[PDB]
Design an enzyme around this catalytic site. Structure first.
Site, PDB file in Angstrom:
ATOM      1  N   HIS A 118      15.199  31.981 -14.917  1.00  0.00           N
ATOM      2  CA  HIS A 118      14.072  32.627 -14.287  1.00  0.00           C
ATOM      3  C   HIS A 118      13.652  33.802 -15.148  1.00  0.00           C
ATOM      4  CE1 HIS A 118      14.350  30.241 -10.690  1.00  0.00           C
ATOM      5  NE2 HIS A 118      15.572  30.665 -10.420  1.00  0.00           N
ATOM      6  N   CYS A 123       9.757  31.333 -15.382  1.00  0.00           N
ATOM      7  CA  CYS A 123       8.600  31.984 -14.794  1.00  0.00           C
ATOM      8  C   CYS A 123       8.291  33.243 -15.583  1.00  0.00           C
ATOM      9  CB  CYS A 123       8.854  32.336 -13.331  1.00  0.00           C
ATOM     10  SG  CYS A 123       8.569  30.957 -12.190  1.00  0.00           S
TER      11      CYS A 123
END
Lengths: 151, 4, 94
Positions: free
Chosen positions: A97, A139
């Protein structure tokens, strides 16, 4: 003709060293409760897939699973201070992430400039003028992109 | 599909 | 003959800045799936940034079919590479 083109559009990196070089893979699946991040299931399929293609291209692949931030920097520094003299180049992949300009290790944020600084010419000289490739599956924020149609 |  | 210390990096991002990336729990993430598929087909033949542009095209045509939260269904992902390269990069076989 008196003016030779000195910047030929066909110029290529010299890819004829002894080794192809290191590819590091930082596979982040699980995270500390303090981070509050959901478990990235499916990332090992990503890791196994990258390691295969990178081996097909000649790299020496080093895949690490769920390292702490200090340990990531340890393996980064290990790559940063190695001798890349007879490597064609260097690859580094990050599967985690992230947001802003940072990715997450097992326990803490890591700014992507921390991943890249140790390879800037003033610190890793054996790579100067060689390609340094960084791949971030993460992300980078929380916006969603809408679907549009050509008219 | 998941978000990551 | 001197170079910038910042020369010859290439930052390959799965999604554009500020945006989500998407991942299949069996097959893996969209971007790595398509990157490896392009690498398998053209790794040793094409310039690295033409591959990334192919990866750009492939991920761009996908659509989130089904999501643990439905507000991303029908949404898209556009990858993005930032090149500080100065020559063409090939991994022709050696």
């Amino acid at each position: 003709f008196y003016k030779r083109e000195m910047f030929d559009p066909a110029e290529e990196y010299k890819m004829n060293h002894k080794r192809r070089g290191l590819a590091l893979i930082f596979n982040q699946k699980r995270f500390d409760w303090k981070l509050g991040l959901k478990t990235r299931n499916g990332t090992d399929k990503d890791r196994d897939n990258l390691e295969r293609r990178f081996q097909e291209l000649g790299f020496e692949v080093k895949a690490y699973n769920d390292l702490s931030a200090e340990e990531v920097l340890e393996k980064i520094q290990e790559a940063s201070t190695a001798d890349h003299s007879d490597a064609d180049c260097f690859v580094c992949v990050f599967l985690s992430h992230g947001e802003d300009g940072h990715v997450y290790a097992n326990d803490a944020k890591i700014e992507i400039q921390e991943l890249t600084n140790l390879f800037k010419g003033d610190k890793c000289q054996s790579l100067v003028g060689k390609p340094k490739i960084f791949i971030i599956q993460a992300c980078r924020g929380d916006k969603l992109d809408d679907a549009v149609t050509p008219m | 599909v998941e978000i990551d | 003959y001197t170079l910038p210390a910042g020369a010859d990096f290439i930052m390959c991002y799965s999604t554009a800045e500020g945006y989500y990336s998407y991942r299949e729990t069996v097959n893996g993430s969209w971007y790595i799936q398509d990157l490896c598929e392009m690498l398998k087909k053209y790794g040793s033949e094409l310039e690295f940034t033409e591959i990334l542009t192919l990866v750009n095209r492939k991920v761009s045509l996908r659509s989130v079919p089904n999501c643990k939260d439905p507000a991303a269904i029908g949404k898209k992902q556009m990858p993005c590479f930032a090149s500080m390269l100065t020559k063409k990069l090939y991994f022709r076989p050696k």
